[PDB]
Amino acid sequence: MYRTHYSSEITEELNGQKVKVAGWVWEVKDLGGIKFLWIRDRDGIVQITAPKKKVDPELFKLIPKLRSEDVVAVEGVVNFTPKAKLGFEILPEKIVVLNRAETPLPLDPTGKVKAELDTRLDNRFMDLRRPEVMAIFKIRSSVFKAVRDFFHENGFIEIHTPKIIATATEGGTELFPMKYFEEDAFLAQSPQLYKQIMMASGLDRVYEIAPIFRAEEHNTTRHLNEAWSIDSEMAFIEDEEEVMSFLERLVAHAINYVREHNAKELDILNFELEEPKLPFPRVSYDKALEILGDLGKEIPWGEDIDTEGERLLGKYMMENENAPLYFLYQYPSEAKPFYIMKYDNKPEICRAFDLEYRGVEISSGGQREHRHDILVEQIKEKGLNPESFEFYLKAFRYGMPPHGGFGLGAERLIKQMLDLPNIREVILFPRDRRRLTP
Amino acid sequence: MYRTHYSSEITEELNGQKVKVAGWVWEVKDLGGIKFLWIRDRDGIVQITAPKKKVDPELFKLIPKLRSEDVVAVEGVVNFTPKAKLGFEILPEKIVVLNRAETPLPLDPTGKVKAELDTRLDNRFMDLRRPEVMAIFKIRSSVFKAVRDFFHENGFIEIHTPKIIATATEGGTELFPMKYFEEDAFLAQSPQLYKQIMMASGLDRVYEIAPIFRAEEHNTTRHLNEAWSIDSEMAFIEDEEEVMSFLERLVAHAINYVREHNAKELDILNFELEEPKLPFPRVSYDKALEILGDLGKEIPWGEDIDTEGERLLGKYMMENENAPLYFLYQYPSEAKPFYIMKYDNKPEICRAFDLEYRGVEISSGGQREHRHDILVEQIKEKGLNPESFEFYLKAFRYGMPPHGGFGLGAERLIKQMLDLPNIREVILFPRDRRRLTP
Numbered sequence: 048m049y050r051t052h053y054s055s056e057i058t059e060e061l062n063g064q065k066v067k068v069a070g071w072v073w074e075v076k077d078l079g080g081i082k083f084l085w086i087r088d089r090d091g092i093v094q095i096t097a098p099k100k101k102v103d104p105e106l107f108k109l110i111p112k113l114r115s116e117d118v119v120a121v122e123g124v125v126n127f128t129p130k131a132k133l134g135f136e137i138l139p140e141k142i143v144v145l146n147r148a149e150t151p152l153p154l155d156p157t158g159k160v161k162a163e164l165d166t167r168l169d170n171r172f173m174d175l176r177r178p179e180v181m182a183i184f185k186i187r188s189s190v191f192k193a194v195r196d197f198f199h200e201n202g203f204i205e206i207h208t209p210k211i212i213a214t215a216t217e218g219g220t221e222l223f224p225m226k227y228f229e230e231d232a233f234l235a236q237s238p239q240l241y242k243q244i245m246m247a248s249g250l251d252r253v254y255e256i257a258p259i260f261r262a263e264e265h266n267t268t269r270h271l272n273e274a275w276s277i278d279s280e281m282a283f284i285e286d287e288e289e290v291m292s293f294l295e296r297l298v299a300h301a302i303n304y305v306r307e308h309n310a311k312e313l314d315i316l317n318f319e320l321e322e323p324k325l326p327f328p329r330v331s332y333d334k335a336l337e338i339l340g341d342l343g344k345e346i347p348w349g350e351d352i353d354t355e356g357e358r359l360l361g362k363y364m365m366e367n368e369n370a371p372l373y374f375l376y377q378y379p380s381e382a383k384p385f386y387i388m389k390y391d392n393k394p395e396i397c398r399a400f401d402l403e404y405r406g407v408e409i410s411s412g413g414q415r416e417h418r419h420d421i422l423v424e425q426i427k428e429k430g431l432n433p434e435s436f437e438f439y440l441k442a443f444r445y446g447m448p449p450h451g452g453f454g455l456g457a458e459r460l461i462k463q464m465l466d467l468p469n470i471r472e473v474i475l476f477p478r479d480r481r482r483l484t485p
Numbered sequence: 486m487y488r489t490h491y492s493s494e495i496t497e498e499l500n501g502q503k504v505k506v507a508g509w510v511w512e513v514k515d516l517g518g519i520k521f522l523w524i525r526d527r528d529g530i531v532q533i534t535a536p537k538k539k540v541d542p543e544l545f546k547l548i549p550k551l552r553s554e555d556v557v558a559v560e561g562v563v564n565f566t567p568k569a570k571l572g573f574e575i576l577p578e579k580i581v582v583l584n585r586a587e588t589p590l591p592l593d594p595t596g597k598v599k600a601e602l603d604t605r606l607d608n609r610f611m612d613l614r615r616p617e618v619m620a621i622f623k624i625r626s627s628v629f630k631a632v633r634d635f636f637h638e639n640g641f642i643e644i645h646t647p648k649i650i651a652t653a654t655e656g657g658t659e660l661f662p663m664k665y666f667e668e669d670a671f672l673a674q675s676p677q678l679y680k681q682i683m684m685a686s687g688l689d690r691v692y693e694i695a696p697i698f699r700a701e702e703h704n705t706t707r708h709l710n711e712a713w714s715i716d717s718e719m720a721f722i723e724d725e726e727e728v729m730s731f732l733e734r735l736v737a738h739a740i741n742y743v744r745e746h747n748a749k750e751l752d753i754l755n756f757e758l759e760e761p762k763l764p765f766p767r768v769s770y771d772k773a774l775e776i777l778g779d780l781g782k783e784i785p786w787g788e789d790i791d792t793e794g795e796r797l798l799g800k801y802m803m804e805n806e807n808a809p810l811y812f813l814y815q816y817p818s819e820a821k822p823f824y825i826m827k828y829d830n831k832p833e834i835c836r837a838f839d840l841e842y843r844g845v846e847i848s849s850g851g852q853r854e855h856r857h858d859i860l861v862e863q864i865k866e867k868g869l870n871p872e873s874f875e876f877y878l879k880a881f882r883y884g885m886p887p888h889g890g891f892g893l894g895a896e897r898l899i900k901q902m903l904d905l906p907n908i909r910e911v912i913l914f915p916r917d918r919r920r921l922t923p
């Protein structure tokens with residue numbers, strides 16, 4: 048390897064020792080009797096100091112020849128000094144140019160000249176050279192780890208279901224059709240039917256973090272045609288509140304991990320991520336409609352709360368409860384999927400829920416209808432054909448325990464967490480109505 | 486929840502205490518003065534003992550009404566005793582029937598009546614109720630966890646790249662053509678182009694575990710049309726051996742985690758998983774051909790080592806080198822992709838490698854050609870058009886460090902690790918030439 052330490056891995060114990068650093072040329076300052084070279088890596092900048100009387104002559108004349116973004120490797124002696132802005136400097140013994148950069152650059156990695164979002168997406172390798180963009184993708188990785196860790200500690204087993212499907216769905220819209228040899232198939236929009244089927248296997252506690260595809264005809268700042276969904280299904284539950292409690296603890300775990308592990312990144316983003324306050328407020332659909340009505344937003348009982356509604360509610364909850372995260376539950380049965388269990392004592396409402404982060408839905412789920420005959424009738428009530436879901440219904444006939452689960456959007460989770468304006472800021476290569484490349 | 490403990494979580498410390506167990510009805514012994522009930526959960530069987538003199542009359546009459554595969558929940562007192570084959574029994578206070586099973590069952594959970602692979606695949610919820618099948622999937626989940634942990638411990642950041650692409654990421658044929666609105670697109674066969682682009686971002690050490698899609702015309706026991714690939718790419722390397730060293734340590738970590746944490750599952754499979762011995766032997770393509778020559782298998786230099794060739798070599802290595810795992814390297818440049826770096830001093834050979842497990846390839850990788858102009862020429866040498874790779878090539882123009890990586894098949898790794906006869910045994914819902922549903 049061309050390096051032995053990253054900028055952040057060099058501490059006081061290494062004073063006076065030889066190390067090897069590598070990265071991109073950030074800045075060169077030829078000041079006559081002394082020269083400076085700044086190298087940038089994933090964690091920061093390293094100062095290479097070259098006093099004329101202390102370095103090799105060929106090295107002294109090589110420095111001013113280095114250009115911005117050239118990939119170089121340096122071996123030298125670590126020297127802790129108050130004179131160095133970051134605490135220490137490297138007195139170079141050997142400098143090697145690994146690869147030279149062309150000019151002009153597609154984007155300004157120094158941040159002076161701002162670039163448009165599409166320019167940044169077309170040149171993602173340049174975009175991440177900026178600390179604030181690198182900060183986002185480091186946090187994204189941390190979020191995925193924290194989530195999986197929580198699942199493991201709670202007895203969940205990771206599963207993997209098919210992305211190429213030829214089965215029926217409740218909506219029948221925004222599906223990406225595709226040919227599978229002689230047959231016609233589609234890309235999966237959710238592992239819903241598969242994770243439910245596995246509740247009849249004994250696995251009991253399952254989770255899957257994989258991509259889902261939806262051919263949305265119009266772009267928004269909240270979704271994309273390709274997303275990473277964090278799915279879970281759990282058996283032997285008594286009600287949907289057990290699922291909500293798990294979800295909030297999961298989300299809280301991810302948020303705290305970022306606060307503990309990525310303080311540097313948060314600081315770079317000039318953002319203060321709040322400490323989760325459990326349990327999050329629960330707001331019934333009825334109560335939500337009442338609050339919105341008083342704010343001028345009138346939604347007829349029975350239909351969905353729209354984009355504007357979520358926004359008004361998220362703001363209301365922040366002003367009245369100082370709650371960036373809260374649940375909406377007890378939705379009308381007519382507004383939710385056929386697989387959600389209705390409240391037996393009040394059939395007009397069901398055991399479904401949605402988790403809102405800063406006014407935007409990041410997750411939805413609920414307790415499912417595990418009783419075969421009732422489930423079949425609910426499919427009929429949706430105006431659908433039960434025979435079309437036979438492969439799925441079959442799993443409910445040979446001993447199916449009570450169960451529930453959720454679907455948590457990874458992009459939406461990170462976007463809302465960092466309070467970013469566009470979902471394209473949290474995924475490397477977005478897919479939308481007009482973007483198929485890179 | 487209807488359960489507080491799984492069969493495997495009840496130990497000495499809980500003797501005389503109340504617990505709640507739940508699962509599927511395994512066996513009922515209907516006797517005049519006593520009733521025995523055995524229920525099965527994901528970890529095993531638990532005995533429920535109900536003497537007429539000690540249980541509620543209603544509970545006594547309920548037990549003989551239970552049938553095979555009914556889902557039940559039981560609250561009772563833990564009682565350790567030598568009289569119970571499993572060390573303890575539960576003295577029931579309450580029994581709830583959660584759901585009833587129909588007969589006949591799609592498959593036989595007792596293992597008495599064997600069913601063909603196709604029937605088992607058509608009924609996975611039933612199939613996993615058998616200890617030998619559940620064992621494979623618990624192991625699969627462990628392998629994924631071990632891999633991710635090793636990546637994180639070594640400074641690797643997780644990334645997520647597009648599965649819907651315009652440019653074929655691996656080549657001609659064995660590709661899934663799909664329409665992206667007006668544009669023609671394909672399902673990704675690999676994250677290759679994307680993981681390389683990220684090497685110019687400063688991320689340096691990346692990994693991605695996600696599905697890949699390849700349309701092969703013929704069914705075999707070693708491959709499927711949909712698979713999960715474990716990809717990685719690392720920068721600032723000096724040669725492909727640095728990548729091979731990392732890959733063997735990763736695979737070793739995965740094997741040891743299974744040996745250390747899934748001993749019970751291995752026992753159920755009646756399989757002895759060997760302790761990995763590093764470093765694995767490295768065998769050049771030339772030497773592999775020489776060995777095959779000894780065994781009477783003539784392969785003209787430049788050509789691929791076929792299935793038969795792999796078997797003989799794996800057998801030779803196992804029996805002569807005591808190595809169930811070994812690398813094949815220094816392949817003919819003509820036989821490898823345009824993105825692999827050739828040996829500058831001997832161009833007919835390249836810096837590519839393949840990892841063999843029990844005579845079957847589970848991974849391939851190598852050092853890439855990071856030098857822009859040479860790369861463009863290699864794309865031309867393969868009869869491809871450099872313009873079709875504009876987004877990729879642009880990443881090699883503004884400071885791109887030396888780099889390399891690998892693609893590790895998850896299903897192939899697990900199938901070979903457990904020496905299973907068919908790859909369809911390690912993935913829940915297989916996708917092959919004739920299997921599209923479930």
Ligand SMILES: N[C@@H](CC(=O)O)C(=O)O
Pocket residue numbers: 655674675677849850851890891892
């Ligand atoms: N992209 C290669 C693996 C690699 O070289 O990383 C493949 O699909 O085999």
